[PDB]
Symmetry: C3
Subunit: 211 residues, 3 copies
């Protein structure tokens, strides 16, 4: 459920979705929220402060303790079957963040498309750190306390090591990324949710990654 | 504290304090042991499964620990150890042991497991099995230190603020820091009290020299 | 506030807000000054000992600071500096200073002390004595930055998110980030307002270029 103030906000949250202990605050005009079926979005605080903002959460998404701040003309899209523990998402500068299907974001994530303040080059006075969209691909696992900064695109089927800060995009899927700066530390892997399988062949969710 | 199951044994001696702490035990044939003169406050401790062993020796002070133990796991914290806020997770039937007279600053994360599997595409095998963590006697973890699976810390070691350990170390009496974690100083001993000018003023340090 | 001891002085301007902030001073000869138009809110500030100094100039905004000062220590924060949630600890009779118009994001941990001694086996002597921290003018600390003892930060520097500083830098007008912390960008100046087109549009930045 939610607290909505302004003109022509559209909030459509499926009746099959649970929103226990969550604060959804929409302050402004022409904002739109869609939450799909069989979601569990609990103990969160989602704030849309501005105009023309979009939040889209697909089916079967489970979120616990997300603190999310969206400003005018920004967009957050989270695709189906993604799960997220406690963390923070911040979108400004009329930008966007997208998180793919069947991602797994462990406690302590911080994801942002913006530094929130300008840096200028002394060579010409011009701003050099404009906001840039973040794209997290399908089936990405962010370990604990991962930080994803502006402009970063993460390929499909990637694991990001605990405590890693990503400043730059990667192109290689099926790898583990860790260190500073962040780099590929292992290639040719696939991760899964349940650790009771002899091999990957026992997890029917993984077939697409190896077939 | 909250118990659902049979043949669970819980001995929390008095002389020891558990103010504002939640203990939940779901399962059977589990054992919780907290020694004398311990301080276990504002913590949330969960045991779920069977034949789990939680052992906290005498003279232990823990404030704000979140601890999760799964079936057939064991956590052992030896005497004199002090701990601030942090997290310990044990799974995959493994164990974590923390030696005597350790000093763990706020922010610690200790676990023997990733909680999820990573397989090789090359042979389909899981490659990140859980492994025991052994933290030696008289270890100081600075703020926000992360100790991951399979790591063994020698006796009398300082780990620098915000360091993450992925690998074991063999050298005692050292300071460890950086990324990757590295020995950055050798032949030291730490103590708890700044007012002790020299290691000779601190009777607790006799054994390390 | 709560104050115990003799010759303790506490001057908090009438024009400053201290909502939800607890201030505790225990000892003798301690001095607290908070200047005009400050907002020092939801903070926990403790002075315990003798001859301690807390100086916070005009137009400083602080939210969620946990600050601990021991005997003969001093903390000085100059005008127009803003600080989110964080921790500052000063012991061993040392000093921390934060210059004018700094911007510290939530999560800072700043200390001049390790709080616990490390001794050399060779001679039994303590070898991690506390050292003073100096953060220059117009320093921006990104989220969750840690500044350890002895560190001096030059004027007009940005420190990147989750960076740990364990040693001093001398280059101004740069961005420092990574582990180990290093200069990753030179010849810059940061400002507060994303709405501005260029550095020239922000009159507070005039003193840093030309
Ligand atoms: C209950 C409690 O446990 C409360 S205590 C928590 C509050 N205190 C802390 O977390 C302690 C903060 N201090 C530190 O982490 C210190 O680095 C510790 C671990 C205490 C060690 O201090 P010291 O023995 O004084 O050595 P320190 O100068 O820090 O570093 C030794 C070398 O290791 C380097 N180093 C330190 N941190 C580094 C890093 N992060 N990356 C790379 N190098 C690093 C230093 O630059 C130095 O190099 P050199 O001088 O030999 O060329
Ligand atoms: C203070 C307040 O009141 C509120 S602020 C709190 C919210 N905002 C934040 O925490 C800011 C988050 N942003 C950052 O940390 C950014 O990195 C900052 C520090 C702002 C810098 O932004 P920019 O000037 O755009 O730097 P950027 O180009 O991304 O720097 C990348 C360069 O420096 C490297 N780099 C950046 N961070 C790095 C890192 N951690 N490790 C290694 N390299 C790093 C990049 O790989 C790249 O190198 P190259 O391309 O020159 O070879």
């Amino acid at each position: 459920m939610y607290s909505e103030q302004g003109i022509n906000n559209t909030i459509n949250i499926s009746t099959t979705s649970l929103t226990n202990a969550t604060q959804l605050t929409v302050i402004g005009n022409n904002n739109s929220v869609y939450i799909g079926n069989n979601c569990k979005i609990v103990s969160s605080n989602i704030r849309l402060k501005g105009n023309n903002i979009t939040l889209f959460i697909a089916d079967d998404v489970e979120i616990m303790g997300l603190v999310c701040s969206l400003h005018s003309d920004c967009s957050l899209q989270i695709q189906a079957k993604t799960t997220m523990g406690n963390g923070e998402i911040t979108i400004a500068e009329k930008g966007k963040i997208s998180i793919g299907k069947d991602c797994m974001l462990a406690h302590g994530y911080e994801i942002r498309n913006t530094d929130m303040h300008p840096i200028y080059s002394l060579e010409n006075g011009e701003r050099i750190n404009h906001g840039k969209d973040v794209i997290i691909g399908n089936h990405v696992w962010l370990g604990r306390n991962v930080t994803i900064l502006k402009g970063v695109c993460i390929p499909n089927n990637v694991v990001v090591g605990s405590h890693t800060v990503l400043y730059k995009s990667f192109k290689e899927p099926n790898c583990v990324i860790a260190g500073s700066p962040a780099k590929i530390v292992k290639e040719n892997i696939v991760w899964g949710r349940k650790m009771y399988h002899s091999t990957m062949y026992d997890d029917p969710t993984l077939n697409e990654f190896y077939k």
